[PDB]
Design a protein around this ligand. Structure first.
Ligand code: 6K4
Length: 277
């Protein structure tokens, strides 16, 4: 499951949280081998007696799932960045096994885009869409620096917190976001992540529409393998579509680097182009 991350070596142990320090509130979601709950966590941070967290309750104990649990936990404690999901630790006393994360008040980015399109309610402006895109790019720069290949970058895997802070996570094939080499040869690299970032940019600028929405899963696969490009969204300025095309070069070595994509987005976010659809 995490074999592709073998070159990543943990410096230290995972933070352990006492079961009695976690107080479950209600389910936030479910899918990837477990339910996610909102909860209160006591004695986690020094200043606050209690705070809200998101808790994933693991469904199994194969015990290949318990082996994957420990490795995943060791990997997540290593990921520490402003735009990467914040992992607090595990609870191993009893069953089910628990993983504790930061609670992100506005939920997933896909639902956030869909509800703020066609917190302050209303449609997100160009400046706000660029700010979202720059934050996701910042997280991807961090992952590329760690030699961490995400493999499933998509807005459904991003979270929105207080003050529109965006963080990348993975809530558990995403063919529509993949380049041809990932679909055909299961080749997942920093370069296939940059392609998915380009698709994330397309999702942002379409307010969360599914890529290749006019096509069946089969038609979408053939279409990506043949080299057809996603159309420019109506809300997308020409400067931003140039970034998408850079992420979508057929040759992985020709794709723009995430450092350059992030730098370009920072420039656009700081001074948005005067663009009107
Ligand atoms: C929107 C839902 C309800 C969806 O479950 N939701 C999940 C929250 C999590 O924090 C979360 C839940 N389960 C698993 C993880 N694991 C990682 O993200 C692993 C990882 C991989 C790669 C990288 Cl680069 C970083 N991290 C995270 C969360 C938090 N708040 C809210 N409101 N909803 C959440």
């Amino acid at each position: 499951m995490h074999h592709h991350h073998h070159h990543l070596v943990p410096r230290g142990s995972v933070h352990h949280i006492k079961r009695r320090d976690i107080v479950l509130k209600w389910e936030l979601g479910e899918g990837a081998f477990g339910k996610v709950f909102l909860a209160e966590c006591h004695n986690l941070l020094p200043e606050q007696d209690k705070m809200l967290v998101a808790v994933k309750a693991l469904k199994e104990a194969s015990e290949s799932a318990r082996q994957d649990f420990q490795r995943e936990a060791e990997l997540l404690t290593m990921l520490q960045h402003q735009h990467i999901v914040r992992f607090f630790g595990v609870c191993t006393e009893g069953r089910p096994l628990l993983m504790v994360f930061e609670y992100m008040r506005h939920g997933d980015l896909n639902r956030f885009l869909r509800s703020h399109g066609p917190v302050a309610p209303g449609p997100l402006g160009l400046g706000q869409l660029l700010a979202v895109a720059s934050q996701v790019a910042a997280g991807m720069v961090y992952l590329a620096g760690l030699h961490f290949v995400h493999r499933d970058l998509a807005t459904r895997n991003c979270l929105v917190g207080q003050g529109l802070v965006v963080k990348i996570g993975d809530f558990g094939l995403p063919i529509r976001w993949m380049p041809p080499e990932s679909i055909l040869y299961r080749k997942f690299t920093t370069e296939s992540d940059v392609w998915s970032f380009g698709v994330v940019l397309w999702e942002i600028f379409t307010y969360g529409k599914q890529p290749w929405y006019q096509l069946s899963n089969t038609e979408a696969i053939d279409c990506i393998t043949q080299g057809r490009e996603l159309e420019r969204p109506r809300a997308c300025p020409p400067e931003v579509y140039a970034i998408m095309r850079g992420c979508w070069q057929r040759e992985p070595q020709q794709r723009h680097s995430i450092k350059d994509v992030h730098a370009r987005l920072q420039a656009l976010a700081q001074a948005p182009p005067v663009y009107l659809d």
